[PDB]
Design a protein around this ligand. Structure first.
Ligand SMILES: *[C@@H]1O[C@H](CO)[C@@H](O)[C@H](O)[C@H]1NC(C)=O
Length: 205
């Protein structure tokens, strides 16, 4: 015999990894006291891609704390009830997106190449960090001719927005230069890459 599904399903954003789901049961008095053997099952998946697998959990309460979620990620949530051999279809879909977190991984695959026929110019390329934890609002490139120099003495080259390439001109020939890159998002700065070395070309004559 079929059960009516949960109603008024809501998401509460607690952190970058936790969302609280709460709902009502119209087969319970206004006060919502669970006196029965009934148990709710909560399922969730990331909104995109469409074909992702639902993760799920059981609760004896009219709320559930969903954990282990990615920062800055939008999720879909539905609930269902089971009172003994009786069960119900999945409730209305509730949506929630976890907060951003500062990046916790440095920019990946940092490379340097000399610009075509312009030896005093270089092109720097990189990849976004694995743990970006938010919409990347830019990067900061640091360069020095002394790898042992303190970060304050390193030349700051900002990169506005999610750009993965940046050209640096007016460099000195036949010289090792060192490069560190760090990512930024709305919540702050993340770790820096390990310095990559590039020696600018020499002239022939
Ligand atoms: C919820 O409980 C049912 C019955 O005990 C079980 O089949 C299901 O796997 C449970 N869900 C999880 C995530 O353990």
């Amino acid at each position: 015999t079929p059960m009516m599904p949960p109603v008024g399903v809501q998401a509460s954003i607690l952190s970058h990894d936790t969302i609280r789901i709460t709902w009502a049961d119209n087969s319970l008095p206004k006060h919502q006291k669970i006196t029965d053997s009934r148990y709710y099952t909560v399922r969730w998946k990331t909104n995109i891609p469409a074909n992702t697998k639902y993760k799920n959990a059981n609760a004896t309460t009219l709320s559930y704390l969903v954990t282990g979620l990615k920062p800055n990620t939008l999720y879909e949530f539905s609930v269902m009830v089971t009172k003994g051999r009786r069960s119900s279809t999945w409730s209305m879909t509730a949506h929630g997106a976890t907060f951003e977190l500062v990046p916790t991984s440095p920019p990946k695959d940092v490379t340097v190449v000399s610009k075509e026929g312009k030896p005093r110019t270089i092109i720097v390329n990189w990849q976004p960090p694995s743990e970006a934890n938010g919409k990347i609002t830019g990067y900061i490139i640091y360069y020095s001719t002394d790898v042992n120099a303190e970060i304050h003495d390193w030349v700051i080259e900002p990169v506005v927005g999610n750009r993965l390439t940046h050209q640096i001109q007016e460099l000195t020939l036949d010289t090792p230069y060192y490069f560190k890159i760090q990512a930024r998002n709305s919540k702050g700065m993340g770790p820096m890459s390990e310095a990559v070395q590039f020696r600018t070309p020499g002239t022939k004559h």
